[PDB]
Amino acid sequence: MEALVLVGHGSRLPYSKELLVKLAEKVKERNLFPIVEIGLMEFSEPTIPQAVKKAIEQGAKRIIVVPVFLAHGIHTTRDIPRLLGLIEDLEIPEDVEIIYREPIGADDRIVDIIIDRAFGR
Amino acid sequence: MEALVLVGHGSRLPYSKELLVKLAEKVKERNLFPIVEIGLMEFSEPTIPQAVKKAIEQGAKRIIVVPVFLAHGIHTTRDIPRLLGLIEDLEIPEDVEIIYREPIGADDRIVDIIIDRAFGR
Numbered sequence: 001m002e003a004l005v006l007v008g009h010g011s012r013l014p015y016s017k018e019l020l021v022k023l024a025e026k027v028k029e030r031n032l033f034p035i036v037e038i039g040l041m042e043f044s045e046p047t048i049p050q051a052v053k054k055a056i057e058q059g060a061k062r063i064i065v066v067p068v069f070l071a072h073g074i075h076t077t078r079d080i081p082r083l084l085g086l087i088e089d090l091e092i093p094e095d096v097e098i099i100y101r102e103p104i105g106a107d108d109r110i111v112d113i114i115i116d117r118a119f120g121r
Numbered sequence: 122m123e124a125l126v127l128v129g130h131g132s133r134l135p136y137s138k139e140l141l142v143k144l145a146e147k148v149k150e151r152n153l154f155p156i157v158e159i160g161l162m163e164f165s166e167p168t169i170p171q172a173v174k175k176a177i178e179q180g181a182k183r184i185i186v187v188p189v190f191l192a193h194g195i196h197t198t199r200d201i202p203r204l205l206g207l208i209e210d211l212e213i214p215e216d217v218e219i220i221y222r223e224p225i226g227a228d229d230r231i232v233d234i235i236i237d238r239a240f241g242r
Contacts (some may be wrong), residue, residue: 004239008191015193022227027236062238068231070129071192072136101238106143108183109230114144115153117222118185121208 003035003060007080008068010040016020017044020068035060041083044081048083049091052098061096069103070110076103123180124156126172128201130231131161141189143221148185151192156181162204170211173219182217190224193229197224 004027008020015120020038028036039051046054055063065084067076081087084098104110125148129141141159149157156179160172167175176184186205188197202208203218211220225231 006235011192011194013194013198016191019201019227023232023235024236025190025231026227026229030232032236033239041226066235066238068191068235069139070189071132073132073134077134081175097143101241103232104231104238106147107234108147109234110143110225111147111151113126113225113228114187114189115151117187117225119152120222 001060002033002059002062002064003037003055004033005037005039005048005055005063005065006068007039007041007048007051007065010042010044013045016040023068033064034058041079045103048080052093053091056096057094063096063098064099064101066101067103071105072103075087122181123154123183123185124158124176124179125154126158126160126169126184126186127189128160128162128169128172130194130196131163131165135163144189146166153233154185155179162200173205173211173213177214177217184219185218185222186219187222188224193224194225218231 010016016087017040024036035055037051037054039046039048069076130137137227138161145157145159156176158172158175160169190197206213
């Protein structure tokens with residue numbers, strides 16, 4: 001019924017995809033969602049349209065898209081809502097709802113992490 | 122003695138800088154570090170060289186640089202260690218050491234946050 005698509009920037013280096021893969025596997029371990037897929041905005045596969053199609057093919061009717069980005073930018077305000085057909089300017093989903101969630105932001109947990117990293121933990 | 126410089130991507134949109142500013146203010150309220158400054162790699166000020174110089178001028182001898190990025194990429198492996206003179210291609214005085222920390226990675230806290238964001242928390 002419900003799918004979680006995690007969507008990330010993607011890079012020419014492999015770290016960005018590897019991080020999405022690891023993060024997807026950790027939410028799988030939580031057993032919260034029937035379907036979990038990943039999608040990279042640029043130069044890596046799977047792409048965002050593929051991740052969404054794969055979620056439909058698995059019979060998700062509600063698709064939760066979470067942009068695994070620190071802050072809003074061009075990616076999260078133009079390109080991604082485009083690729084998801086949420087914005088009037090290569091794929092369509094027919095009859096199902098995409099729910100586009102927020103980025104990570106200045107969460108208190110990010111300041112815990114940063115403080116750990118600052119001490120080499 | 123010790124300064125924490127948080128360094129982030131920067132954007133043409135303002136969210137990226139605003140997130141670093143918020144994150145810096147949150148670590149300031151923790152009272153862990155004598156000096157805390159921020160630096161944006163591109164498009165915005167303060168820049169990484171300015172953030173580091175400011176920290177020296179405040180009398181930091183140990184400068185902890187934390188890249189506020191989700192994964193390693195070109196930014197964290199080429200451009201930033203460049204801007205920090207950490208890589209033979211900014212006059213850091215020898216009596217100062219820059220300690221370049223790791224990015225955020227696939228932290229368990231990031232999967233907590235993603236799960237929150239997936240439910241619109």
